[model samples]
Structures are given as C-alpha cells and as structure tokens.
Target: KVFGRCELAAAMKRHGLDNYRGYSLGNWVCAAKFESNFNTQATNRNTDGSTDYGILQINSRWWCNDGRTPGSRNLCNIPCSALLSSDITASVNCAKKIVSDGNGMNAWVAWRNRCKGTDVQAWIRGCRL
Candidate 1:
C-alpha cells in the first residue's frame, strides 16, 4: 500500500508510534516517507547479505528472520515477509523494538540525513493527527 502522507501519519499514530521512545509522530512519518515512501511492500538488499523490509525498512540482520541473514538476532521474532504486508502491525512493532533497543531513529541513516533536527512539522502539516 502506498499511503499518502497524512494517511501514513494516521496509521503510525494509531499504532502508538506518536511520542514513542521520545520520537514524535512527525519523526516516524518522516522516516517512513524517506525510508520507503509509504510503500508497505518496499524492500532493500544490503551488501552485507541483509535485507530491509516494509515501510520503516526493518532490517533482517537484527530485526526480522529472513532465513538468509547470517546469525540474525531476530529480535522482533517476525519473518521478514510479515513486514511486507499492508497491515504494518509487525513493521511498527519491529520499529518500536529497534528504538527501544537504544538505537533511536539514528538506526535509519535516512532519518539522520533528512529528518534529524529539522522542521519535521512539514512532514505532518495539514494532516489530521
């Protein structure tokens, strides 16, 4: 599912991502925008033999079990395939775990380069929260 910006914000907010781990709704929304452009099926393969999945690009190296990443922690205990679904429940959960594990939004380089310390309000502007 390719969500509009406001639609994506509402989805993440409804899933309790707002103010999650000290990151605001805008931060999460912005990250999703840059990470996967709100496409739930987005995936990226890394040179390390790991793959990123879903909207927030939860990584197989540490977050999901793809049965390919070497020595995966599978901390989310979710299959990488689960993140590709439009539901986004597992994606949001895995993202929560990522932040909860002391990584913060810095876990996403896109967030650091595009969202960090910026006026993220634009990411959610005119959107119904």
Candidate 2:
C-alpha cells in the first residue's frame, strides 16, 4: 500500500509514533517518505545481502528475520514478510522497538540523512495532526 503524506502520518500516530521517545510524528513521516516512499511492500537488498522491508525499511540484519540473511538477529521477533503488509501493525511495532533500542531514530539511515536535526514540520503539514 502506498500512502499519501498525511495519511501515513495519521497511521503512524495511531500506532503510537506521535512524540514517541522525543521523536515527533513528522520525523517518522519524513523517514517513511525517503525510505520507502510510503509503500508498505517496498523492499531493498543491501550490498551486504541484508534486505530492508516495508514503509520504514526495517532491515533484516538486526530486525526482522527474512530467513536468508546470515547471522540475522531477529531482534524484532517477526518475519520480514510481516513488515510488507498493508496493515503496518508489525512494521510500526518493530520500528518502535528499533527506536527504543538505544539508537533512537538514528537506527534509520533515511531519518539520519533526511529528517534528523531538521525542522520536519513540512512532513506533517495540513494533516490536522
């Protein structure tokens, strides 16, 4: 599922991402845009043979278990396929876990490169929050 900006923002909020651990909803929305363009089924295979899955692009190396990445940690305790679902519940929960794992939002490269230390107000503009 490909979500519009405001739509994705609302969804993330419903999953308890709004102001989660000091990162605002806009920060999460911004990461989704750059990571997967809000597409739940998006997948990217990294050069290290690990794959990123879903809207937030959760990685296989330490998060979801894709059953292919060697030495995967599966720290999220979910199958990578679950992250690709339109429901987004698993993806959202996994993302929350990632953020709380001592990395904050810096776990995502997209967030670091595009959202961190920036005014992300534009990412949630006109959504009525």
Candidate 3:
C-alpha cells in the first residue's frame, strides 16, 4: 500500500492523469480498484501462462515478463516487475501509453466488464482530491 485511496487519486492527477487523453480519472481509479485493490505488490498467475502485476494488473502477455513464461510480446517495453513498485510512476506512464494505443480502458478487462458505464463516483468519494 504505497498510498491510500485519497493519495492515489491526487497523485494520479498530479502525474498528469487528470482527464488524460480524453480518458477520465474515474475510469482509471475504478479500474485500479477492481484490478489490484490498490496494492502494488499484487501478482496473480493466469491460466494462459501469463501473469498480472501491480495496481493496474497489467498482463505479462503484452506488458511484462516474469522470466518464466515465453512469447511475451511486451509492447510497453517495461519489465513486468517494474509495475509492481509502490511509486506508481512507471505504471502510470505505461497506462497512458496503453490508452493512446487505441485500447482505451479496454486494455483492462476489469474496466470493460465492471467499471464500464457504471456509476463510479464512489471509487473516488470522500477523497476531497
């Protein structure tokens, strides 16, 4: 837990994620919440020989490599372990690149299936950010 819910939102905005590239901060926040519960150390092995890492739960298939799985077509060009850091700088930057790649928030399945079109204000509620 590098930051609490409030600090996370403010940090994201301060890092240029506020309405970045036409994507709302609420969507990112909601996606993060669902993806990793705001935990940077989160790592889960997928059935497809790919792993997900960090608060965004970026996939190993295209974002990072665990050195265990092969055929990792890393597009972000970042080591998957880098996204697991508490600083979140690398994660934030990579997320921006992902959105710009035309994936939008669709890069994350959690956002598509869960946060999409939902009343997501509660994710950032009471933060006063």
Candidate 4:
C-alpha cells in the first residue's frame, strides 16, 4: 500500500514512533514489515487457535478481545478486530502497554523470536526518520 519501506518509515516516524519506549524505529519497522506487511486488514490464525490482529499482529491470546475467542486476557481492553484499520494509533497505544508488561518489544513473538538481537538497519534504510 505504500511506495516503499521509506514511506512506511516516514509515516511511522511522523506518528512519534521513531523511538518508542526505548525501542528503536528499526525494530518496529522490521517487525511490522514482516508481521503483516503493514496491511491493516491482515490477520492470521495462530497454531494455538488464536488469531493475530492487524499491523503489529497482536495476538488474540492476551492483548485484544475477539468475540469468538474465550480465553483472551484482553489486557489491552480493546477488541482484537479494532486493530484492523488504516490508522495505527490504536495499535501503537496497545503496543505501548504490551512492551511495558515485560521485556519490552520482546513481548511480541515476532520481535522476540525473530527480530530480537538483529542488526535491522535494513528496515529503515534511506528513510527519513
């Protein structure tokens, strides 16, 4: 939906996400790039039977509540479907709480298992941030 990674990076930086909660913009960019390619409507059914929400792909297991699911901790206090939108302010707000709960960005499985401890400058290469 964007021209390129730089466009996504520029948009993210403009939203005050260049350096959020001490996590560099690269981490966010890298994760979002892989998570769902920044498609707001993106969703994935996890192997655990939970569905991942949009953008950052927050799982329905804990963060957001999707009515059909029963065991969501719903820590973010918002519907899982709410994350499916062109605007990511809601996603960023929820991500803030998700990062606060533990090892920061590592709370995201995508960030932890894959993106963590990686030199991710490629995520924002040539982007204005």
The per-prediction CA RMSD against the true structure, in angstroms, equals 0.8, 0.9, 1.5, 1.9
Q: Which candidate has the top score in lDDT?
A: 2
Q: Candidates ranked by lDDT, best first?
A: 2, 1, 3, 4
TM-score of each: 0.97, 0.96, 0.90, 0.86
lDDT of 2 by residue, 1-129 (tens): 999999999889998999999888999999999999999999999999999999999999999899999987999999999999989899999998899999799889989998898889889989966
> 70, model 2: CA deviation in Å?
1.0
Candidate 1 global TM-score? 0.97
Off by over 4 Å in 1: none
Candidate 3, residue 96: how far the Cα is off, in Å: 1.0
Off by over 4 Å in 4: 1-3
- Give candidate 1's error at residue 43 in angstroms: 0.8
Tell me which of candidates 2 and 3 scores higher on TM-score. Answer: 2
Candidate 3: count the clashes. 0
Question: Comparing 1 and 4 by lDDT, which wins?
Answer: 1
Candidate 3 global CA lDDT score: 0.84
At residue 19, what lDDT does model 1 achieve? Answer: 95
